[PDB]
Amino acid sequence: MEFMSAPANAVAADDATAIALKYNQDATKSERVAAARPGLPPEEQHCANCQFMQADAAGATDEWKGCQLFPGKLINVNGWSASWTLKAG
Amino acid sequence: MEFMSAPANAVAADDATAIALKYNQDATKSERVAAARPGLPPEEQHCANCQFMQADAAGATDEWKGCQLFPGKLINVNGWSASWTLKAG
Amino acid sequence: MEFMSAPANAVAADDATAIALKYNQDATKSERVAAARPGLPPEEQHCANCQFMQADAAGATDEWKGCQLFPGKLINVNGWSASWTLKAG
Amino acid sequence: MEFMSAPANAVAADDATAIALKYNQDATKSERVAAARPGLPPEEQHCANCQFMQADAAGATDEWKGCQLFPGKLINVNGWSASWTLKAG
Numbered sequence: 001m002e003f004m005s006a007p008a009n010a011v012a013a014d015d016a017t018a019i020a021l022k023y024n025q026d027a028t029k030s031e032r033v034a035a036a037r038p039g040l041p042p043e044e045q046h047c048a049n050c051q052f053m054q055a056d057a058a059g060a061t062d063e064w065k066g067c068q069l070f071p072g073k074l075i076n077v078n079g080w081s082a083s084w085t086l087k088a089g
Numbered sequence: 090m091e092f093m094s095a096p097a098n099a100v101a102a103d104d105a106t107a108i109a110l111k112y113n114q115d116a117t118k119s120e121r122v123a124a125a126r127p128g129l130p131p132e133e134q135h136c137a138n139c140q141f142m143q144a145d146a147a148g149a150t151d152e153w154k155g156c157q158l159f160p161g162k163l164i165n166v167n168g169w170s171a172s173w174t175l176k177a178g
Numbered sequence: 179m180e181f182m183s184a185p186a187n188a189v190a191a192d193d194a195t196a197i198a199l200k201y202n203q204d205a206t207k208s209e210r211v212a213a214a215r216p217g218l219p220p221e222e223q224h225c226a227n228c229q230f231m232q233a234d235a236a237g238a239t240d241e242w243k244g245c246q247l248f249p250g251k252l253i254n255v256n257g258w259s260a261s262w263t264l265k266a267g
Numbered sequence: 268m269e270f271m272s273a274p275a276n277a278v279a280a281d282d283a284t285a286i287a288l289k290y291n292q293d294a295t296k297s298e299r300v301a302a303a304r305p306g307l308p309p310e311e312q313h314c315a316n317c318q319f320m321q322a323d324a325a326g327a328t329d330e331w332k333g334c335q336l337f338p339g340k341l342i343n344v345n346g347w348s349a350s351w352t353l354k355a356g
């Protein structure tokens with residue numbers, strides 16, 4: 001595989017929105033256990049299985065995808081935020 | 090009936106999760122018609138017969154119930170969202 | 179990952195102990211609100227933040243852990259029983 | 268100039284160590300801006316001016332050098348990783 005470029009509009013650690021929504025690009029380092037959102041055990045929760053992850057957003061790759069709660073941005077498929085909600089598959 | 094107080098955690102219209110899920114407290118003013126989700130004729134679709142409705146959520150009353158897609162929140166039994174799926178059993 | 183699948187010794191709904199101790203593997207469906215045990219808001223209480231949860235137990239996973247009040251069995255990190263107690267440390 | 272021979276042991280995108288280090292062989296496609304590591308503006312950071320680049324590594328050339336954090340591998344002088352540190356001297 002070729003290296004996966006990091007989008008200029010990916011949510012960053014230094015963004016007020018990320019701080020507000022407790023988003024972390026790496027779910028393993030997130031507060032998912034402390035949040036204890038309902039749906040899946042906490043350590044299985046990440047953007048890849050969240051209701052708001054948008055696979056068809058401008059600039060999306062299999063590593064970077066959109067989120068309906070972060071307009072005009074891109075989150076990491078391995079991330080997590082406190083709005084994590086199991087996708088109604 | 091008596092004037093029933095609206096729960097402090099009822100899903101509000103200007104909540105980003107609500108906007109993304111296309112939830113309307115009133116099914117009769119919702120996108121159920123245009124969406125024509127499978128299961129039942131659109132005019133019959135509301136949270137009361139949705140699979141994700143949680144009748145025994147904390148604080149639920151005969152008018153406000155929980156929803157798997159709105160952790161910690163309460164929705165109206167006569168509401169609807171783009172996630173509506175006919176309840177089985 | 180795989181679907182929710184309780185290991186061999188997961189406390190079961192028709193286990194006399196479970197019934198006696200008011201345990202439910204899903205805290206959002208338990209009597210935590212009615213019981214209103216002291217320490218934290220009832221809706222914030224679950225096995226993961228209970229003093230009796232034991233991280234080091236046979237067959238334990240990120241989702242299933244031991245509980246000192248259920249010797250030899252496993253409970254869900256998202257569960258709750260009427261013995262929920264503050265996590266001292 | 269003649270074509271720059273690539274090494275078979277170049278760090279590759281699907282190497283767990285590369286992923287963990289946030290390495291990208293093309294720094295302009297990396298997370299350096301988001302990382303905002305100290306010493307130089309993000310846009311000026313690459314392996315060529317990193318403290319850990321190892322010029323005297325087996326098979327190292329004009330374009331590929333070693334890195335203390337990647338034993339037995341070679342990085343691209345134009346690359347970058349989240350361990351970038353301005354070289355002193």
Ligand code: SF4
Nearest residue numbers: 047050053067081084
């Ligand atoms: S809302 Fe879902 S998709 Fe968006 S950042 Fe949070 S966990 Fe990821």
Ligand code: SF4
Nearest residue numbers: 136139156170172173
């Ligand atoms: S998912 Fe079902 S219960 Fe929840 S808001 Fe939508 S229609 Fe109502």
Ligand code: SF4
Nearest residue numbers: 225228245259261262
């Ligand atoms: S005592 Fe604590 S760990 Fe054990 S079942 Fe009850 S709430 Fe869970």
Ligand code: SF4
Nearest residue numbers: 314317320334348351
């Ligand atoms: S540590 Fe320095 S030399 Fe090694 S990959 Fe990172 S930036 Fe390049």
